[PDB]
C-alpha cells in the first residue's frame, strides 16, 4: 500500500521572498478505506471537479448516492484542517481543484448457489482522493466565436511551408 497523498500535505515550502505573490493554499485529503465501488464513486468525483466548496456541499446534501454523503464528510474534514492547520482565513474561499477515486484492497469469498454452482464473491473497497485549492473556482471556458475560428484557419494557411523544394 502507498499513502503518498498524505505526504503531499506534509510538504513544507521555503519561506516566501518579499517579491513573491502570496502562495495559494493546496490541501490534499483522502479516505483510504471505503466499502464502495471506485467506479460508482468516480461519477460523483467527475461532476464536482472545479466547483466551489459551498456549491459542492449543497449538491451533496441533496444527493441520493451513499458515496456523496461520504464525500461531504471528507470535504468537511479537509475544510476544518485547512483553517485550523493550513492558515485559511475564509471558510467559503475554497474550490474543488481535483477529485478522483481509486481501488482499495478487497476481501475474497466463495459465492454458493442453490443449484450446486459456486462463484467468486468480492467485497469491494476504494480510495477517494481530493485536492482543494484556496480561492474561488476558475471561470468556466467560453466557446470560441466564429471570428476566432476563422482567424486560426487563415493563420494556419499562412503558416503553411513549401515541402520538398530547394
Amino acid at each position: 500500500i502507498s499513502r503518498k497523498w498524505e505526504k503531499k500535505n506534509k510538504i513544507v515550502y521555503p519561506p516566501q521572498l518579499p517579491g513573491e505573490p502570496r502562495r495559494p493554499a493546496e490541501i490534499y485529503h483522502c479516505r483510504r478505506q471505503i466499502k464502495y465501488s471506485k467506479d460508482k464513486m468516480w461519477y460523483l468525483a467527475k461532476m464536482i471537479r472545479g466547483m466551489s466548496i459551498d456549491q459542492a456541499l449543497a449538491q451533496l446534501e441533496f444527493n441520493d448516492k451513499k458515496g456523496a454523503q461520504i464525500i461531504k464528510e471528507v470535504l468537511l474534514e479537509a475544510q476544518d484542517m485547512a483553517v485550523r492547520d493550513h492558515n485559511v482565513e475564509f471558510r467559503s474561499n475554497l474550490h474543488i481543484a481535483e477529485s478522483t477515486s481509486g481501488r482499495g484492497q478487497c476481501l475474497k469469498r466463495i459465492r454458493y448457489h442453490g443449484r450446486g454452482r459456486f462463484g467468486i464473491m468480492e467485497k469491494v473497497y476504494c480510495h477517494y482522493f481530493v485536492k482543494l485549492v484556496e480561492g474561488p473556482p476558475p471561470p468556466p471556458e467560453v466557446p470560441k466565436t466564429a471570428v476566432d475560428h476563422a482567424k486560426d484557419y487563415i493563420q494556419q494557411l499562412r503558416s503553411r511551408t513549401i515541402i520538398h523544394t530547394l
Binding site: 466551489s52 466548496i53 459551498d54 456549491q55 482565513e89 475564509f90 471558510r91 467559503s92 474561499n93
Partner: protein, 292 residues
Amino acid sequence: SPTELTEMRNDLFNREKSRQLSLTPRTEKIEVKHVGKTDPGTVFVMNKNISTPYSCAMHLSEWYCSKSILALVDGQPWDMYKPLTKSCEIKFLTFKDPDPKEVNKAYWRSCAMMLGCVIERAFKDDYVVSLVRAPEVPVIAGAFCYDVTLDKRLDEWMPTKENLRSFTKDAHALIYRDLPFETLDVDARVALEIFQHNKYKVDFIEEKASQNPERIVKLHRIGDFIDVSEGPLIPRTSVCFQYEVSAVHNLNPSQPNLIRRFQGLSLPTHLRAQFTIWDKLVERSRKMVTED
C-alpha cells in the same frame, strides 16, 4: 477634453484613499459581534478601517456574500464594501428582508448614479453636457429620474427609439462590466475642486456639507465616473438584471439650458420579472414623473 477631467478627478479620488490609509497607523483590532438572525452571536476580530462586511461574509459562507447587499452596523445601513470603523453589531440585509425600504433607496440611488454616467459619455465631446442633480422619487412613481442640462446645440435634438436603446446599451455594458461601487467620505473643499466645473453639482455638495456639522460629503465612484450620493448605494453594477431607459421629458422652462428628466427602470437579478410584466412596467414608466 473630457478625459482630462476624469484623469484629475480620478487622481484626487486616489489621493484621498492614500490619505485615509496613511491616517490609520498599523492594524487595529475591533471586536464585531454578529447580531443577524442567522448564526447569531458570532464575534469577528477585524482590522479597523481595513476590512469590510464582505470579508465577514466570506468568513462564514458564500451564501452570505451572494444574498447580502447591505449590512446593519449598530442598526445603521452600511455598504458591503465599506471599511469598518469600530467594534459594533453587524447584521446582513437581503433583497427579501421584511423591510427592504433601506435597500430600495440604495438601489434607487445607485440606478440614478449609473444613468448619470451614461449621459455624460453618451454625447460627443463637441457638445457640453452638465448634470444638475438626481431627483429623489418614490419607487411607487414607476421610474427613477435623473435631471441633466444640455448645450444649446442639442436644443432641437430629441432621442429616438434607437437613441434610447443606445443608452441602455451603455447601461448594459456597465452592468456587464460589473464595476464595484467605490465609496469615499470627502470634505467639501476637496469635493468642490473635484466638481468645480459643474456649478449645479457644487451647490448640491454645499447642501450636504451644510447639513452635517463637518464638511464631509458622500462620494461614490463607478470606475472613472464619480458622483455625490444621498445615501448608501448598491455594491456592484452586476446586481441589475433588467435595464431600460423608458423615456425623456424636457422641462418647459429651460431657456438658459435644456433640462431633461430621464425615466428608467431596472430590476436586480434576485428579482426577475416576466416578459409581459416588464412590458407593462416599462409602458407605465414612460409617463412624466412628478416629485411628491
